Design an enzyme around this catalytic site. Structure first.
Site, PDB file in Angstrom:
ATOM      1  N   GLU A 158      -7.245 -14.333  11.325  1.00 55.62           N
ATOM      2  CA  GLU A 158      -8.052 -15.068  11.615  1.00 55.62           C
ATOM      3  C   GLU A 158      -8.805 -15.438  10.294  1.00 55.62           C
ATOM      4  OE1 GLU A 158      -9.687 -14.125  15.389  1.00 55.62           O
ATOM      5  OE2 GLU A 158      -8.794 -15.674  16.378  1.00 55.62           O
TER       6      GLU A 158
HETATM    7  N1  LIG Z   1      -5.674 -12.176  24.312  1.00 54.48           N
HETATM    8  C1  LIG Z   1      -6.456 -13.098  23.642  1.00 54.48           C
HETATM    9  N2  LIG Z   1      -7.004 -14.196  24.029  1.00 54.48           N
HETATM   10  C2  LIG Z   1      -7.922 -15.115  23.237  1.00 54.48           C
HETATM   11  N3  LIG Z   1      -7.983 -15.049  21.624  1.00 54.48           N
HETATM   12  C3  LIG Z   1      -7.115 -13.525  21.362  1.00 54.48           C
HETATM   13  C4  LIG Z   1      -6.670 -12.542  22.097  1.00 54.48           C
HETATM   14  N4  LIG Z   1      -6.061 -11.692  21.494  1.00 54.48           N
HETATM   15  C5  LIG Z   1      -6.383 -11.934  20.357  1.00 54.48           C
HETATM   16  N5  LIG Z   1      -7.162 -13.163  19.980  1.00 54.48           N
HETATM   17  C6  LIG Z   1      -7.948 -13.507  18.638  1.00 54.48           C
HETATM   18  C7  LIG Z   1      -9.279 -14.192  19.065  1.00 54.48           C
HETATM   19  C8  LIG Z   1     -10.163 -13.017  18.419  1.00 54.48           C
HETATM   20  O1  LIG Z   1     -11.030 -13.554  17.569  1.00 54.48           O
HETATM   21  C9  LIG Z   1      -9.029 -12.076  17.648  1.00 54.48           C
HETATM   22  C10 LIG Z   1      -9.099 -10.683  18.726  1.00 54.48           C
HETATM   23  O2  LIG Z   1      -8.016  -9.676  18.257  1.00 54.48           O
HETATM   24  O3  LIG Z   1      -7.988 -12.742  17.596  1.00 54.48           O
END
Ligand SMILES: Nc1ncnc2c1ncn2[C@H]1C[C@H](O)[C@@H](CO)O1
Ligand SMILES: Nc1ncnc2c1ncn2[C@H]1C[C@H](O)[C@@H](CO)O1
Ligand SMILES: Nc1ncnc2c1ncn2[C@H]1C[C@H](O)[C@@H](CO)O1
Ligand SMILES: Nc1ncnc2c1ncn2[C@H]1C[C@H](O)[C@@H](CO)O1
Ligand SMILES: Nc1ncnc2c1ncn2[C@H]1C[C@H](O)[C@@H](CO)O1
Ligand SMILES: Nc1ncnc2c1ncn2[C@H]1C[C@H](O)[C@@H](CO)O1
Lengths: 167, 167, 167, 165, 167, 165
Positions: free
Chosen positions: F99
């Site tokens: 991100e």
């Molecule tokens: N299971 C999930 N639901 C929503 N967002 C998620 C998920 N896994 C990763 N992310 C994204 C958002 C966080 O900033 C970051 C967490 O590793 O990457």
């Protein structure tokens, strides 16, 4: 369709310093060099920028802003010039630098080939959603490493990540 | 100036459900094949992704999310790798997929060659403003199809859309 | 989470030549007007540019390059300022201008709310792959038009297109 | 790292007004022409003809010509992998600057090749140009490096020794 | 349409240090502060980054990479956060920094309001093509400076440059 | 420079697995909630339900859920003016890193809020994160600055004092 000349410009992203990681990188180059669709391969750790105004360069030390900027930019430039990214992804010791580049490349809409590696094949298969969804093509480093040699980088056909649990 | 090697990488966008549309595509490929400025041409309908988990896949039918993502990404990938877009644009049955792609490519600042085709060459010439202004070079499909064989895709000289009413 | 102030800036894309299309637009504005999450809404056909050097400008007629550039830019500007797109998408008479815009917005990574309308709710449900995969949230115009009044445009929760055949 | 084929696609941006500028552009082309890492070079002044323009350089140009020509340049920028700017430090060219900013916003590398006929003046540079450019090659003392520079990877070389206004 | 809350986020680009240029900047702020469509205005020269590791900061001197990076980034961030750019453009002493930002903003597809200023109103009116075409709206600094107060920054209606000779 | 209305739109990226991470996210939200420069905060874990998913966290998730959830995050990133990352320095989160890279490629500012429960280890940081991030606010010693930081302009604060691998 068939390319008239090699069109693939690879940004070879990968962690380094670590024994197994260097080996992967070295093998990746060999494989890629055998790929007729590749016109150029850029590996961030090959050559480096030397800041004449940097007394005793400490690899792992603080490091000057000039060197940091120039090095970071060399990578962004490689990403900019590249048509696609190939990431030797370490699933045992996650590399945020590589993950950063994957995000950067996807934001540029460029294809990203994930080449996952694990020294614990018996362990649970899991992947962060962002990586599993961001990646456009997965080629298992442990089982299909060789494919990097045949993969058509002129078009980078996609292959969505599947079979990995997602937290 | 003169290129040392062909550098034009074409994303050949086009509808591909009517016989006339596919015949234009076929012809387009042949013409593009004769252009010395072209290094590669990608046509979205040439290959395709196969979802093993997709039982009895039918065209126009409900497709698996995996197939959808893979296929859509193959097109975005083609757009990303391309230096320019060439759209065999059916003026009689507007294709929103091609329009979406033209918009996507222009947002990326990539030149877009519009090649309009109509089975009614004598009817009114009207074009949507976004397409008329979005495209950078127009090559009439009805009477100038053949210049695709000579157009300099290394630089894609501009040729603004003119002569079309805007609604 | 809950926003301190409305942050949703909508680019309301839509054809606007048929009576039915303009009625949907009118209705869309009214619904959007009742949504507390919306800070602003831009509708391309609300204002317009006037080229003083353009004598007797007619709609669908040959327009001046200045008017064309100004008008096209007003739309790209609206797209740029917008946080999301809401397209009153006519499924019966495909609009390439809207499709071009959806593509442009997605290339910018902006969420796109598709609001499909058809005068034949009982006929086959088919959608172009690029639109089906390009849009991030679908709100049926025929039966869910009204949720535009409540949808949280501060975050634009995703709702993948499903139930449509892909050709 | 060694390219199988030249991949360097150069957008040679530069003012093309004074004779000195015309001479630099002429040399640059010759120099770049010897670089084996370059696959193509685009020089915006090598133009579009508006058949409906009854036209004087420097005069009022038709909007069609303006659009086509401006686009020809953006197209060159889009196709280019990097930019090489024969940057006149004496008579600042806002056109070139525009293009530099445009290319950087696209994350593309920009090689600045500054020229000055007034060494007597303090070497200064606008911050945006100093931080935006990714590689600098002095046009007065290193002009020749363009024939050898590796445009396949465009190695970084931050701007230094320039006072920032 | 009418915004529910101010939406305009202005990146106020302009040369500085010079007497007349500072005055223009100062007056611009006043005018903008009077504009109801503006939610925020960012002016690069207001506040600055202080590098504690910078002995005797020489305004116009060499300057550390840290300060340069941080300052340049503060501007890129302002450009990123902004919805549009307003440039107090000096036509007598061209500013490449401002021109750089105009190019950067247009590449991001953001609207750019050019506010040209000249102390030699009698001289020939000329403008570099890139500026004349890149700019989306021109508001003569010499004759319509006041408009910055009424201009609707929620939508930034375009106004193509015209009347300027182009070399 | 003073905002007429809060314009800061935060994408609060962060791992949400260990209890410690859950606690940090909880605090951050509370802190950001007091910042008058913020108009909105998006935390990805506050989800989508695939009606056709008969689902276990950590298990195989349907592609629809995956797409919708991933998009919800990209949407949050698109809408956001800046990113605030509760960056776990002990258990690196590649999702957050992804991100960060994504946001920077979009030229958006990124505020890194690092956390470490092992002060004993040499403070080191991957180059990409060190150079990509535009502002750093130590989560262990400056966590509270989030309630006062001016997100309307996101003032830069380069990463320093971190050894680069
Ligand atoms: N299971 C999930 N639901 C929503 N967002 C998620 C998920 N896994 C990763 N992310 C994204 C958002 C966080 O900033 C970051 C967490 O590793 O990457
Ligand atoms: N010190 C460095 N020199 C060059 N490239 C570097 C460095 N640190 C991180 N990277 C980038 C490149 C790798 O793909 C990935 C490794 O984490 O991130
Ligand atoms: N089913 C499909 N497979 C591959 N590509 C597809 C598909 N549907 C639309 N497209 C894209 C490519 C064309 O340029 C255009 C055709 O409408 O949009
Ligand atoms: N003549 C026009 N004036 C303003 N906007 C226009 C025009 N033609 C197309 N558009 C854009 C905006 C709509 O969302 C969509 C309508 O096809 O594409
Ligand atoms: N008249 C013109 N024809 C073609 N390109 C032009 C023109 N004026 C400016 N440019 C662009 C290209 C140069 O890199 C730079 C010169 O200022 O900006
Ligand atoms: N030293 C500086 N501090 C802050 N911003 C600066 C600086 N130099 C150039 N700029 C940017 C902002 C102006 O819009 C324009 C002035 O040339 O370019």
């Amino acid at each position: 369709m068939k390319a008239v000349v090699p069109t693939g410009k690879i940004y070879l992203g990968s962690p380094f310093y670590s024994d197994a990681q260097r080996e992967r990188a070295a093998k990746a180059k060999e494989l890629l060099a055998k790929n007729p669709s590749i016109a150029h391969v850029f590996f961030p750790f090959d050559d480096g920028f030397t800041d004449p105004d940097e007394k005793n360069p400490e690899i792992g030390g603080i490091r000057s802003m000039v060197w940091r900027d120039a090095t970071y930019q060399n990578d962004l430039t490689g990403i900019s010039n590249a048509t696609c990214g190939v990431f030797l992804y370490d699933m045992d010791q996650l590399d945020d630098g590589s993950a950063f580049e994957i995000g950067f490349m996807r934001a540029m809409h460029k294809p990203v080939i994930l080449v996952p590696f694990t020294e614990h094949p018996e362990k649970e298969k899991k992947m962060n959603l962002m990586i599993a969804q961001g990646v456009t093509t997965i080629i298992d480093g442990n089982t299909e490493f060789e494919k990097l040699a045949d993969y058509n980088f002129n078009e980078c056909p996609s292959n969505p990540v599947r079979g990995y649990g997602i937290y």
